[PDB]
Amino acid sequence: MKKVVTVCPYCASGCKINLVVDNGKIVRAEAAQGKTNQGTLCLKGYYGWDFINDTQILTPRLKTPMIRRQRGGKLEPVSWDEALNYVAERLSAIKEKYGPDAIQTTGSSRGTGNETNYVMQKFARAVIGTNNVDCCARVXHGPSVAGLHQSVGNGAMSNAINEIDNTDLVFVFGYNPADSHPIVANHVINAKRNGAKIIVCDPRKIETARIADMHIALKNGSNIALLNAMGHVIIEENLYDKAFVASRTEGFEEYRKIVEGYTPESVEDITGVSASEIRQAARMYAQAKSAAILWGMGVTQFYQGVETVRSLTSLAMLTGNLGKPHAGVNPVRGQNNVQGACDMGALPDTYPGYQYVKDPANREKFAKAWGVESLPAHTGYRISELPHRAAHGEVRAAYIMGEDPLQTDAELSAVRKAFEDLELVIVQDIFMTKTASAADVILPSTSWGEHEGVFTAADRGFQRFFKAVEPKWDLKTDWQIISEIATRMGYPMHYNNTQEIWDELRHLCPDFYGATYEKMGELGFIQWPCRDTSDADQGTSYLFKEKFDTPNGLAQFFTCDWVAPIDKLTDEYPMVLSTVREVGHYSCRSMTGNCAALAALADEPGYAQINTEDAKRLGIEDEALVWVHSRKGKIITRAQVSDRPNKGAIYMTYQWWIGACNELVTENLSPITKTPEYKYCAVRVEPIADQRAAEQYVIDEYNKLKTRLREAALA
Ligand SMILES: Nc1nc2c(c(=O)[nH]1)N[C@H]1C(S)=C(S)[C@@H](COP(=O)(O)OP(=O)(O)OC[C@H]3O[C@@H](n4cnc5c(=O)[nH]c(N)nc54)[C@H](O)[C@@H]3O)O[C@H]1N2
Ligand SMILES: Nc1nc2c(c(=O)[nH]1)N[C@H]1C(S)=C(S)[C@@H](COP(=O)(O)OP(=O)(O)OC[C@H]3O[C@@H](n4cnc5c(=O)[nH]c(N)nc54)[C@H](O)[C@@H]3O)O[C@H]1N2
Ligand code: SF4
Ligand SMILES: O=N[O-]
Ligand SMILES: [Mo+6]
């Protein structure tokens, strides 16, 4: 019986797991002594691995390639050679006829690893000849990287996860660690335990807030109002870092101006927070010898997102909370490998190792190495513009890999039509997901326990994950399917194992070079940049120590005027719908929902956190199927009356296939990074009278979709 070390494929906490294999099967999971977790895991890492075994509780795992030769339906299995020639032929045709930009590809932030994300960009850029590569960063912390790129020159977690434990103040802002990154929550709690203070800036009363010295329940969509007022205080009371500011920043004056306007008192109503609280919070944050900002989607997913990020970073600049351990700016990245996909270049504007295509010196390099003449220099099409490109016929095929847009994108109807507007849609997944079912050609790959590679934790930390099991079917790794189509497309590519990819990679990215496999090892956590192979170079813990990576070394101060979300509330729909997630289930729920213990604590249709006080006045009671309509749709869910959600707004998640919250979200793509404002959706929650009839609706509807996918998978 053996133990094969791996890294959890759920959140970006990057918990090392020991998968105990017995005979030729995974028998049980158990926390390894990784850097971030140290013997601990949450319910998912512990219970969420039996999805490898094709439970079929939700969707049967993909066993064979498929092709839908006619658009009038019928996805019938076909052999590898047949699907692989079909793709290489089609993509070839679409490329000559309409140019390389006519094709869009996507990386993957889940079980593939950094290795395949790298290969995919390489394919798009060296074989198709397009910079059209993008991953979920688009929909998640895109804002985070832009604002943080301009302000501080780096969009990654400024400091380390393992570094939280010694801050003197955890400024948690619009982010729920207890539900999103449990091991990160346990680092924050640790900090509190070690005497750090804690501030939670969330409308809702998240578990986190219960342990916090201060809960600033700001009104849904008022971040800049509160943010400016804190700066107003940090400057008014001369609480800022004069020397840090003056010597390591740019833009203090112009920033100083705006905040002067925003005074605690002029905020009261917008923030819904008392000028005092605002002062006490600014006084507090500013007063901690070392205070660190952890933030998430309660920031990024508001179109004023790039601004709020840039704004928080300002407080940190203003307080010298950067360039030192246990401080900094920390957008805790979401998916297990979302950080890594960017690190590999599954972005339409950078090569792996964060070497943008605009730079010709980089192109000279990559093209030489890939044995190519020229590598595209203009930015690719961001995946979030696909339906716009698609309708416009600017894009004609999409090679969707390791993603589920048809369930996770905003305004799902749009995605649907996008698929119906594209010439060829290629889904390369591991489960017959809602998206894979609308595919033109499906290509199955190896699940997380069936292959290996590297993943990047939320804080730039590289970690190795090893193969524990053989696939039970003819499945190629994601990098073998791509390599093989490249080759059929005339560009010769074949890799013996993931490390070969990792070393080519290392030779092309000066910051990832010292991160050798030997170095990462079984329990090593190597946060880049790791320059030399020398074991003395164990990696970069916190960033911006000497300079700021900005073109002129200084951090760039910034803010703007508060601005409300798009969807305007009407007297008829006074309720604010703010999407979020739940513990126990993870994102598209294909893995998680197909796990026996997890499926058992939550199935269809999902919950809506409705506020106590106002639910009583709504005729809605705990556990009743209710409705929520929207300009984008009308979803049914199970209510859950409680005193946690903020009276006025409700909260729903995007993990359920039936009560699909996303079904009603308008994509108010941030002008900048093109990001959806999933945290603000104007909704109407009308109670359901005949529950018995509703309980059958949920059932019937669910059963319909599950049989739907099931047939298609096993047909
Ligand atoms: N259990 C589990 N964990 C996950 C996931 C999952 O599916 N399941 N998904 C993972 C992924 S992909 C991601 S990106 C992370 C995201 O994890 P988080 O960053 O925690 O994101 P959310 O939970 O979507 O929302 C964060 C908080 O912002 C708050 N918020 C809403 N509006 C505002 C506002 O106007 N101001 C402020 N300050 N806050 C506001 C919301 O109330 C919510 O509590 O979760 C990851 N971890
Ligand atoms: N309402 C609302 N919507 C949201 C959000 C929100 O907060 N509110 N959050 C948004 C955010 S932050 C994110 S990250 C998106 C999530 O973006 P999604 O695309 O939903 O991410 P997942 O849900 O992980 O989907 C991953 C897919 O990868 C497949 N897969 C797993 N391992 C492999 C592999 O190794 N190879 C291949 N070929 N496929 C594999 C899985 O079976 C699944 O089909 O959701 C977003 N949608
Ligand atoms: S879901 Fe996260 S906190 Fe949980 S075990 Fe996985 S990596 Fe760790
Ligand atoms: O961008 N984080 O999922
Ligand atoms: Mo995310």
User: Is residue 245 within 8 Å of residue 317, measured between CB atoms?
Assistant: yes
| DSSP codes, 163-179 | GGGG-SEEEEES--HHH
What phi and psi, each to the nearest 5 degrees, are found at residue 272? Answer: 75, 15
Its sign, for the CA torsion 440, 444, 445, 449, is positive
* Secondary structure element (H or E) that encloses residue 355, with its range: strand 355-356
Give the relative orientation of helices 498-508 and 114-122 as an angle to the nearest 10 degrees.
70
Ligand 3 atom nearest residue 182's Cα: 3
User: Is residue 712 within 8 Å of residue 432, measured between CB atoms?
Assistant: yes
The CA distances from residue 446 to 50, 431, 471, 472, in Å, are 14, 10, 7, 10
| Residue 15 assigned ligand-binding role | yes
| Residue 594 assigned ligand-binding role | no
Domain ranges of the chain: 1-58, 59-139+334-529, 141-333, 568-688, 689-715
Q: Does the annotation count 472 as an active-site position?
A: no
Largest CA distance in the chain: 71
Q: Is 15 a pocket residue for ligand 3 (Cβ < 6 Å)?
A: yes
Give the relative orientation of helices 305-318 and 223-236 as an angle to the nearest 10 degrees.
20
Dist. CA 657–CA 635, nearest whole Å: 11
Provide the pairing of β-strand 76-77 with 66-67.
Answer: antiparallel
> Which residue has 């101060």 as its token pair?
557
Residue range 141-333 in CATH 3.40.50.9100: no
Q: Is 59 a pocket residue for ligand 2 (Cβ < 6 Å)?
A: no
Tell me which amino acid residue 702 is.
Y
Its sign, for the CA torsion 517, 523, 529, 533, is negative
Those residues with Cβ within 8 angstroms of residue 554's Cβ, 6 or more apart along the chain or in another chain:
248, 249, 250, 548
Q: Is 333 a pocket residue for ligand 4 (Cβ < 6 Å)?
A: yes
Q: Is 11 a pocket residue for ligand 4 (Cβ < 6 Å)?
A: no
Residue nearest atom 2 in ligand 3 by C-alpha distance: 11
Question: How far does the centroid of ligand 1 lie from the alpha carbon of residue 467, in Å?
Answer: 31
Output 76-85 pairs: Cβ under 8 A, ≥24 positions apart: 76/715, 77/715, 80/474, 80/476, 83/441, 83/442, 83/443, 84/443, 84/481, 84/484, 84/485, 84/488, 85/488
Ligand index nearest the alpha carbon of residue 137: 4
Question: How far does the centroid of ligand 5 lie from the alpha carbon of residue 657, in Å?
Answer: 18
Q: Does the annotation count 140 as an active-site position?
A: yes
Three-state SS letters, 531-590: CCCCCCCCCCCCCCCCCCCCCCCCEECCCCCCCCCCCCCECCECEEEEEECCCCCCCCCC
Dist. CA 576–CA 71, nearest whole Å: 39
User: Is residue 330 within 8 Å of residue 568, measured between CB atoms?
Assistant: no
Give the relative orientation of helices 498-508 and 360-369 as an angle to the nearest 10 degrees.
140
Residues paired with 713 in a beta bridge: none
CA nearest to 331, candidates 360, 296, 363, 362: 296
Q: Is 380 a pocket residue for ligand 4 (Cβ < 6 Å)?
A: no
According to DSSP, residue 352 is labeled G
Question: How far does the centroid of ligand 4 lie from the alpha carbon of residue 140, in Å?
Answer: 4
34 CA to centre of own chain? 22
Question: How far does the centroid of ligand 4 lie from the alpha carbon of residue 686, in Å?
Answer: 33
Which CATH fold topology does 59-139+334-529 show?
A: Rossmann fold (3.40.50)
| Residue 518 assigned ligand-binding role | no
User: Is residue 26 within 8 Å of residue 469, measured between CB atoms?
Assistant: yes
Q: Is 226 a pocket residue for ligand 1 (Cβ < 6 Å)?
A: no
**Class of 1-58 in CATH:** mainly beta
| Per-residue tokens: 520 | 């990462």
Its sign, for the CA torsion 317, 318, 323, 326, is negative
| Residue 335 assigned ligand-binding role | yes
Q: Select from 3.40.50.300, 1.20.5.460, 1.10.630.10, 3.30.750.24 the CATH code of 689-715.
A: 1.20.5.460
Question: How far does the centroid of ligand 1 lie from the alpha carbon of residue 17, in Å?
Answer: 24
The catalytically annotated residue of 35, 44, 219, 706 is 44
| Per-residue tokens: 154 | 């780096």
Three-state SS letters, 287-308: HCCCCEEEECHHHHCCCCHHHH
CA nearest to 278, candidates 333, 210, 227, 344: 227
Residue range 568-688 in CATH 2.160.20.10: no
The CA distances from residue 527 to 31, 200, 541, in Å, are 21, 27, 6
SS3 (DSSP) at 332: coil
Ligand index nearest the alpha carbon of residue 202: 1
Tell me which amino acid residue 138 is.
R
Q: Is 10 a pocket residue for ligand 2 (Cβ < 6 Å)?
A: no
| Residue 493 assigned ligand-binding role | no
User: Is residue 288 within 8 Å of residue 125, measured between CB atoms?
Assistant: no
